[PDB]
Write a protein that binds this ligand. Structure first.
Ligand SMILES: [Zn+2]
Ligand SMILES: [Zn+2]
Lengths: 185, 303, 135, 374
């Protein structure tokens, strides 16, 4: 009954006050986390402990991935440690961090953990394909930023870029009025 | 202006190899050694590390070393004599000498050091060896070097060396590096056409010892270029001045501010300097870059 | 049994298998079970790990659920190779003081024959070391 | 290095913040503070320590040629470590962005606000000496053109002292003392510029519309393009006093001018100035872009009037992607499956009434859709 009053467009607590385009995005996202159909009981309980319940999953995912890593801690990729949570939360429906509270809180968690643990998060490898997914750009601008070298190193499916360099290139050249860091501060 | 088929200058700054020493307590010196990748580290009971080399400033900039066109030869001699009169050698001689007087020629050995000291011994000089005690504390900016008791007397040597047909100006530089216990030292290393790193070495007494090369040292004195578009950090002075962290050329020929495009405008720069209105900062920046490449020397030919 | 890796790095994955073999031997205080790698090639340690004399520990079971696992000669640790690094040469002199330290000198020419260190760490302290293992 | 955060203010500029950190922590000036800050970034192995400037003027990340990504990593490193309580320093900087305006003007971004690049001041920054001696800092609004009066003191800004010398607070401190005469600068009263200054500051100013701050600067850049001159404070407030029927009066006069000067008429031949100069200011959010929201309101009730004059205007495949907000690959796909009815990309093969109704069919969004101007 709470989700039905929440999907209708009214204020339902503890669920967040979001626009109607985003409230359906959380329901599709919650079906991807449990990898099953939608459960009404665990959905309301998950936002009752917001945001520290969502922080508890990301800690358990990076502890699970690091222990089961098949490559050298320096050869770790972004899809090998945060391939499920990050790529499954970019466009739900879009990158407006004012209303996409999943991507807004995941970038809040990864900002205070960039150069902790000897720079574990900031040294994660990325391609040129999955750099355009985060930066919201094209492969022509990526190939231009290796000519003028704003971005520091072409095979598009090659792992030549680090996550801390892509995260700080976004804070330099790719913010917008909706997708920028000033909402989760 | 056309480039001739013969145009070449000699360099006006001549550094040498940097030799490393280990000073033990009770003050006796021993050349530093290394293992074989090669690894070099400070021995255990050591106090500090000496470094010593020499720099000359020897006025080869005034005339070309080789020039088969008498029109282009007279174009140089007007440029150097008008740069000297209108602008002066105070700006370039300050920027070269600050790389000697801090530890710029100590590339990655300044890194993680407690303190380091520089002692100059200029040759046409009376006495009282010029000392620079505790850089990273005392000598931070340009004004910190000027507050030294004798900074004007050493800048005016390099000015006199460039402003005379026989200017000599020899400096004997000696450093004193206080490292942590069993610390890194990073010397220069050889070029192999191929982790697998070989050091450059000489022989002092009967033992191999790492050096920091003569061409490596001259590339640290000539990190002056910041006159290029944006100019975030200084670049080693060269034609189409490159960076080597990123393999890029700032001052590309598409920019129009490389050294070979400024040579074609060298006739234009003579009437700017021979007027009475002070030149714009951008034009002088191209005059500092023009002079710093003639101090660097090189073949300037074509065809 | 032999565990064959099929997903990668065989260096930093065979070193994790020995840490589970390490922590097993202090719960039960047993030292009988040993380790060897049949594919001990020069390029890499290999993708095959076998124990002779562990599969009910939490590490091997969770790694089994994923797509990657399968579940004469002597392999001994050489800690003289740990003394050949220049950080270890300074550890050696501090004991001999506890005396001219300048009387010592470096070897300046050393040859090392196929040390195959597996990187691990300690849990009693927060400190790192290697497994320099030869034949 | 260990520092102390001063009194925080969300309207303080970045160049005014480093002066207050240096004065609180006992440094001599800001030249010394940035040079000691570069020394700290070297000691903790930052990749771009050598590009950190010692000049206060080039500190902002739009100034850096290739150090833009290393500059914001440097700014994020300082706020996490060198302070007793973490400040907000990325929120005060002026970053570049990939957002373009109409037709091709680039843009910059400061926190939760996007500015036009052409309205950024680069020669000399004016100031208000009354705010310098009451608030104790400088605001970011002094770096942008159009903001000519103070929104809280109603006094014009100053660029020159009484002795002919300019006063830049980045090089002459925050006190308000000149360099040549070492005296406080004597001041130099309208209403129409006071309303826009209170409107650009973020407060409600009537009759100007309640817009977010990213959109209020977009109207000022748009108003300079209509008059094809500099910004006029008197005609700007009067234009929104008769909203929306003043903006309706221009569009009628533009279509009467281009008809007199008909099946071959193009969209760029009748509405080439108003339509293409109002798409992205900064974006297509019709809830807040009231110019594009009202222009599509005017062209909806005039599609098949006058024997379908507006609905038969020719368009290319290039300028179809500008309206639909798509790419040339989706346009070439919709001529394969023929949702869109007719390839040369610069060829006039599509009509405006078909592009307008294809947008209502396949290209609406939660922000760019018709449901706001109803
Ligand atoms: Zn004011
Ligand atoms: Zn004055």
């Amino acid at each position: 009954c709470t989700v039905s009053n929440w999907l209708a467009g009214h204020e339902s607590k503890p669920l967040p006050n979001l626009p109607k385009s985003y409230r359906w995005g959380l329901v599709h996202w919650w079906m991807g986390i449990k990898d099953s159909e939608f459960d009404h009981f665990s959905f309301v309980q998950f936002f009752s402990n917001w945001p520290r319940s969502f922080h508890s999953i990301i800690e358990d995912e990076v502890e699970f991935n690091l222990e089961h890593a098949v490559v050298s801690t320096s050869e770790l990729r972004l899809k090998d440690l945060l391939g499920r949570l990050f790529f499954g939360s970019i466009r739900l429906p879009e990158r407006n961090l004012q209303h996409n509270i999943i991507l807004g809180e995941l970038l809040c968690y990864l900002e205070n953990r960039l150069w902790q643990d000897k720079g574990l998060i900031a040294n994660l490898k990325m391609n040129a394909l999955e750099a355009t997914v985060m930066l919201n750009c094209s492969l022509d601008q990526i190939a231009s930023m290796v000519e003028q070298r704003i971005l520091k190193p072409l095979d598009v499916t090659d792992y030549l870029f680090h996550f801390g360099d892509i995260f700080c290139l976004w804070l330099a050249e790719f913010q917008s009025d909706e997708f920028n860091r000033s909402f989760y501060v | 202006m056309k480039l001739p088929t013969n145009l070449a200058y000699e360099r006006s700054i001549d550094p040498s190899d940097v030799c490393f020493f280990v000073v033990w307590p009770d003050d006796r010196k021993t050349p530093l050694t290394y293992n074989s990748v090669d690894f070099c580290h400070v021995p255990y009971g050591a106090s500090h590390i000496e470094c010593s080399f020499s720099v000359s400033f020897s006025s080869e900039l005034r005339q070309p070393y080789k020039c088969n066109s008498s029109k282009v030869k007279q174009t140089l001699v007007q440029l150097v004599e008008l740069y000297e009169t209108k602008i002066g050698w105070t700006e370039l001689a300050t920027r070269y000498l600050m790389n000697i007087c801090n530890g710029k020629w100590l590339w990655k050995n300044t890194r993680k050091a407690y303190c380091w000291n520089i002692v100059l011994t200029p040759w046409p000089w009376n006495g009282e060896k010029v000392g620079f005690e505790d850089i990273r504390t005392n000598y931070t900016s340009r004004q910190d070097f000027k507050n030294n008791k004798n900074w004007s007397a050493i800048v005016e040597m390099i000015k006199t060396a460039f402003s005379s047909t026989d200017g000599l100006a020899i400096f004997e530089v000696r450093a004193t590096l206080h490292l942590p216990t069993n610390a890194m030292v990073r010397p220069s290393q050889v070029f192999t056409e191929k982790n697998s790193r070989v050091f450059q070495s000489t022989t002092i007494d009967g033992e191999r010892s790492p050096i920091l090369g003569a061409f490596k040292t001259g590339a640290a004195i000539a990190t002056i270029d910041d006159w290029y578009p944006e100019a975030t950090e200084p670049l080693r002075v060269g034609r189409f001045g490159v960076h080597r962290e990123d393999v890029t050329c700032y001052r590309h020929p598409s920019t129009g501010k490389d050294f070979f495009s400024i040579l074609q405008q060298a006739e234009h720069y003579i009437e700017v300097l021979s007027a009475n209105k002070t030149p714009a900062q951008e034009t002088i920046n191209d005059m500092h870059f023009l002079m710093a490449n003639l101090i660097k020397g090189g073949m300037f030919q074509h065809k | 049994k032999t565990i064959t890796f099929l997903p990668c790095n065989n260096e930093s994955l065979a070193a994790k298998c020995l840490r589970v073999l390490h922590g097993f031997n202090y719960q039960y205080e047993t030292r009988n079970i040993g380790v060897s790698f049949p594919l001990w090639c020069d390029a890499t340690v290999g993708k095959k790990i076998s124990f002779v004399s562990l599969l009910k520990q939490h590490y091997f079971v969770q790694m089994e659920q994923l797509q990657y696992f399968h579940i004469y000669v002597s392999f001994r640790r050489c800690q003289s190779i740990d003394k050949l690094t220049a950080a270890g040469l300074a550890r050696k002199i501090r004991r001999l003081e506890k005396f001219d330290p300048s009387s010592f000198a470096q070897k300046e020419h050393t040859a090392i024959a196929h040390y195959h260190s597996l990187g691990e760490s300690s849990k009693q302290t927060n400190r790192n070391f290697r497994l320099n293992i030869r034949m | 290095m260990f520092l102390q955060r001063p009194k925080p203010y969300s309207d303080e500029s970045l160049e005014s913040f480093f002066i207050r950190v240096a004065n609180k922590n006992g440094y001599g000036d800001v030249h010394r503070f940035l040079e000691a800050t570069k020394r700290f970034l070297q000691d903790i192995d930052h990749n771009g320590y050598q590009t950190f400037p010692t000049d206060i003027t080039r500190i902002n990340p739009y100034s850096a040629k290739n150090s833009s990504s290393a500059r914001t990593a440097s700014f994020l490193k300082l706020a996490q470590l060198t302070f007793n309580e973490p400040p907000e320093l990325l929120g005060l900087a002026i970053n570049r962005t990939n957002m373009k305006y109409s037709p091709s003007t680039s843009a910059v971004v400061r926190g939760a606000e996007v500015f036009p690049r052409s309205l950024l001041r680069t020669h000399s920054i004016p100031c208000c000496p009354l705010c310098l001696r009451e608030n104790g800092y400088a605001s970011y609004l002094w770096h942008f053109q159009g903001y000519e009066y103070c929104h809280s003191h109603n006094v014009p800004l100053i660029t020159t002292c009484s002795c002919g010398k300019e006063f830049d607070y980045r090089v002459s401190g925050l006190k308000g003392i000149c360099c040549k005469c070492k005296e406080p600068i004597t001041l130099t009263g309208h209403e129409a510029a006071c309303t826009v200054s209170n409107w650009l500051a973020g407060h409600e100013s009537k009759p100007l519309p309640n817009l977010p701050k990213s959109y209020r600067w977009g109207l000022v850049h748009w108003w300079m393009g209509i008059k094809d001159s500099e910004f006029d404070h008197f005609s700007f407030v009067q234009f929104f006093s008769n909203w929306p029927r003043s903006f309706h009066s221009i569009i009628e006069d533009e279509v009467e001018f281009n008809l007199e000067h008909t099946s071959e008429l193009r969209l760029k031949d009748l509405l080439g100035r108003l339509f293409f100069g109002s798409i992205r200011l900064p974006e297509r959010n019709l809830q807040h872009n009231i110019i594009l929201g009202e222009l599509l309101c005017y062209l909806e009730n005039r599609l098949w009037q006058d024997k379908g004059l507006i609905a038969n205007l020719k368009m290319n495949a290039l300028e179809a992607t500008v309206m639909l907000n798509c790419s040339l690959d989706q346009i070439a796909s919709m001529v394969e499956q023929r949702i869109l009815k007719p390839l040369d990309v610069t060829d006039y093969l599509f009509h405006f009434g078909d592009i307008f109704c294809l947008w209502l069919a396949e290209f609406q969004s939660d922000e760019f859709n018709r449901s706001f101007y109803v």
